[PDB]
């Protein structure tokens, strides 16, 4: 882990969520790709994975497999909480052989309508927070920026600015991140994806 | 004719049992048979809880049902729970039970189970549901149904009685009338076993402090409640 | 139809395969066991066919230095009992008690009556796996005369019998049982006094004395 | 830990301290190191707590099965079971056990299973980290036949010295007496044995 | 060298419900008839005879339900395995051949009853476009333009042969399927509660929404518009 | 095939378990189990016609655990097999769950084993009844009976054997008269006397100290009475 | 006519307690040729007498199991091969683990134990060969039947009109029992015994095989120009 | 019988002809129905690999298994010996597979 | 725990025209102590074949016993074929390579 770089941050607003990530992929100091997206979505739930890129791709494929089978069997899209439990169980199934990843789940429950964000450790310990979740090689800078900037009950327009500023300023202080950023603003029925202009790229 | 037809005959020779689904719940009812006053009826249960929201009743060979209840309880945790952190919906649990019965039918050197199951349950995004599982391994949803010995007359009465606006109390009343019309011996609260899948009961959870955690929807009526209901017939 | 395979219950609730095994047991030679004061004596008849060495055809066997016992079925049972006794000794560091050994043998024999894929034993511990404690035990072709003699001995000795006289009584009973047919006698001993509680074969002068006493009777 | 078991005229007496330490910190000060594996067969455990507890539970299960099948096991049988468990898994266990019991053999019986799984039968045995300081004393104040009160006093003096000179031993002194009358449990507090 | 078990399975299928699949120049239409009625049996058993294997392939069933469920679960697992392995949707022919091989294996080894189920596959891929297949217990799969399985196979085949064109539209195929079913059922008239419908069509925008399974209200509206 | 193996007959029957019910009566021994307010009594016939037998080794009563006892009707090999299995299960339960196995749980385990025997073709049923008795920590005096068909249930009182019908009828009449579910006798000796008197009245015969076998379950443990205790109980009965 | 309902498998008892398959396996020995076994106090010999046609060789009847023990067979050849291989393995184990030559009585016990397993298994078949085992020095002689029985005899004969040899041995027991120190005379006595079992058939250097083992004499097989009565 | 009935089932299959010449080999369909799509049709002549081709006669479903096994064996031989399979080796492998399937009961 | 040891000794095999010679020490030692002053190292396995394994005494004894057992079973299975010296060498090579990853710690001269 910590050889490819990458940072993801999720925040909860008023009837909406935001999830942003960097785009750098590299082999230690050398930069390889500036288009390596680390955010995926199944149904209406979004997942960001930091750490080893191979494990990120493997987990994305496995979770797409499981979510498609779930939709076929239950005739219903999976909710963020059930997906969080599934991810935690899958991560714990690899005890002593863990995937070197940091996962973060975001989304709005279709039925209840409230936002939901959560994070996972190496072996699938669920960390549910009502304000923000951070992951990556710049987690300390992300924690500082989120603690300084975040406010409860933010409109999507203000939430986008807050999360973008936090991500950009955290990435500018990390050597293994900052080759482009992408932000998802997720509402009850509409999702907006935006690319950010930043230095070093 | 094969082993499945013989198991169906054995089911037809068993005690009746019923099942009625209303708009806001499901009612299961059956009669306990023990032609021995020395034996204690309370030690034997014919309605078994599978999950806090799913219960089952049977007609046929008792020991087979006793083994199948334990198998279903184990499979409700091994397969769905401990993965998604919640109890399975009624359809998936019924499918797993039908898979168990199908494997019993198809396995060599093993005879099929001689029971038919009526499974009642509730789940989110699907409401209340009632299903019947045959010894072969095929399950069918029902609005109101009966099995066992006097199943033909019970089915006729249910067809003449069931409608779309039926409520839980009306379903209980109809089930009690159907049981009374075909009771083999003695019709009182100690010989009737009735359960309902309905509203969540916070007083049966056992603890307080978690607002999201709700009580079970399965509720087994006591002898006193059954006697009070019979006093209203 | 019910008697053509093992582990099949007849309409009255019987396993005719075990009954046929008992019939096979009833065709065997006589074996006698006498429970004296602090000891047991075993006696065996051995038919002579011809060119046969008169001394080495031993039918008596010992388990764990302190237990005495279709010949190949009996050999198989004795081997399994020896394995069980060795397992008990290794687990608990003490010689296996006689009731424990009998219970393990009974369980092993009853195992061979549960499946139609195996044949019940045809030895004597009955072929059904049943067993009990006895003051005197008789099996074989001439078992009824031996049972009558043992009942006579029990009536005549309400306070117990000595091992030394029990050997001679066993020899006499064996000769009386063989009297029906028209042979060698093997005797084995296990007593707390003359053997210190270890199973032994009684031969030499005492064997000759027992043979002479039986012949004079 | 300081553990001992001594045979006297009416049976056997087991004594132990009540201190369990994680490094230099006392995790438990009311530990009960006297474990019952049969109605009149008890064991004293030293070493790893998990290993000793697991071995005691397995021995208790085996002895219960033996009682169900055969009757009343002897103390030598329990010692043999302990020896088998310790010797088969010597590479993954750290347990020193003293097995003391009263039966028809009379005068009590004591067996020792030290590290490695060996078996030694002794009139009296001491074990634990605190026993090293009370060896010579116990060799100068032991007699083959003693009464109950004298044996209790001997145990109290030995364990008092062991607690005094060993920092890994402390707390209250717990004693178990196994006689034909049954099982007796005795507690001696620091205000009592710190003087005599 | 006839196979008696396969013949028995085919005879059993001949007594099952009738399914019709019609392929047009811009879509595929699947229809099925519900036969079981008890005045108390629930009709919300998800979809009784029409099933989705993925976002691109659908199947119509004629025969025993348990074998159908087993085969459909296996097909779904195979499709997801292909998607995970190659990051692309599985071609229809590959999945059809996989299921046909499973059936053939079940018709060769002793101790296994052949699957008494007939499948009608309707799929779409970028190699051949729209594809329609039929698979039987014998293990053979055949492509078709308009096919029917179940009870009145011969009459439905004749009716389709009379009134099929190579350039029909999706609505034309829907009307043809409805009229063919209405003229072959032994229940006088065709009703919405006894019918299951599905369409696989691609619009002007390359979205490929191949999951349109008709609701009972939609089936009733289509029947009213057609005039059945 | 349907007559020799455990499969359904065209009438939906099981003509290998009913034969086991027939085999349960190979012996001619009648057993009676009653329960007091703080005890449970089991009495069984003991027949030793042979003079070469050792009467001490003839018994149909087993001590499964400290508090649970069992009485078996049927052949002794199956009885001892079931007793060994029950003892092993009780020991395993104690090792696993850390507390003593209840009587009803053991009966349910044995009934499930019997059901497994009935459902698998290569295994034959055991022709035994396996009446378990105990004084439960939560329930109290409890009697639970099984059968080769896998069916088990608890009883206030029960009787087994070829002549069980008369004993059952007398018990039913007595419990109808008393209108209570047990026998009102604080001491278990009185309960044993009542059971012996009931068996004498039902069978219409007298017993000596060598014609009966008694087992008593209390809160402390379950134990089998010796011949001298049976003789003293018979003397106490004869005194009134 | 007279159909037997209890001779199908080896796991069914006759109503009188018989095992017909075991008896048939015993009768299978009569198919094989004649083998004769003697025993003195210092030596033991075996004499064995088939040829498919004039252009074929002769079947081997004597098999060496170790340097001090051997056997002869009558009946099914593959069963004899399996039993001889098992006995060789047992002797090898005894010589390797304990450096101890296996006793003949223990070998007979092992053969009986192995043969017993085929009479109770179902789906198999009992052995169809009878064996004559001879050992070192005192000298020993065993007769093994497929039923699982050993005898420890002075002498015997098995297979294909062997009753004449057996009667001759019963007559001349006291004569041949004490020919200690002269193996050749014991061999000649065995030759006369096997000649007593021949219906006018002659003995040549192609049909006769001999085996000898005694004190200071390892197990030795004579065939060909070595059985010319030299 | 089992082999004879298999041969009878073979006799009901579509005709197939194979001819060899000086430097070439020539390998030689029923009447399709009016509603049958022939755009996607499994050709009766399946190439096992770039130099060996196969043509079946009999049951098509059972021939698919043989074709798949032959292709897998050819690829395995190519990966194991670096040399593409010969004609006789592949024919012997197919014959061995069929002979193995004839035994062990062999209903078909 | 070290499963290997050294016991000293030396052996010498010389092949002539119609004869062979295998000579060896008789001293068995451990470190600086003499275990035995007379322990033969050269044996006679039969068929005019002599083999000596020098080094670890336990491995040498095991190899000698295994080779003699192989020779006796070869005589059993091939009608006393009188195993040749080159065949014996090949068989010993197979025996030694059988324990490729737990090798005999000996030097063999035949």
Author numbering:
A (entry chain J): 5 to 205
B (entry chain B): 18 to 250
C (entry chain G): 7 to 56, 58 to 76, 81 to 135, 151 to 208, 212 to 246
D (entry chain H): 1 to 196
E (entry chain C): 17 to 244
F (entry chain A): 12 to 251
G (entry chain F): 1 to 49, 51 to 138, 141 to 233
H (entry chain D): 18 to 45, 48 to 127
According to the publication:
The pool of proteasomal complexes isolated via the FLAG-6xHis-tag purification on the β4-subunit also contained pre1−1CP-Blm10 complexes in sufficient amounts for 3D reconstruction. The copurified complex was resolved to 2.4 Å and represents the first structurally characterized native Blm10–proteasome complex isolated from yeast cells. In contrast to previous reconstituted structures, Blm10 caps only one end of the CP in the pre1−1CP-Blm10 complex, reflecting a low abundance of Blm10 in vivo. The Blm10-bound α-ring in the pre1−1CP-Blm10 structure is in an open-gate conformation similar to already-reported RP-bound CPs and the crystal structure of the reconstituted complex. An overlay with the wt 20S CP structure shows that the α3-subunit is poorly resolved compared with the other subunits in the pre1−1CP-Blm10 map, implying high flexibility in this area. We conclude that this effect is mainly caused by the association of Blm10 with the pre1−1CP. Furthermore, α4 and α5 are slightly shifted away from the ring centre.
The 26S proteasome is composed of a 20S catalytic core particle (CP), to the ends of which two 19S regulatory particles (RPs) are attached. The cylindrical shape is formed by four stacked heptameric rings, with the two inner ones composed of β-subunits and two outer ones of α-subunits. The multicatalytic properties of this proteolytic machine are provided by the subunits β1, β2, and β5. All active CP subunits are initially synthesized in a precursor form with N-terminal propeptides (β1pro, β2pro, and β5pro) that are autocatalytically processed upon CP formation.
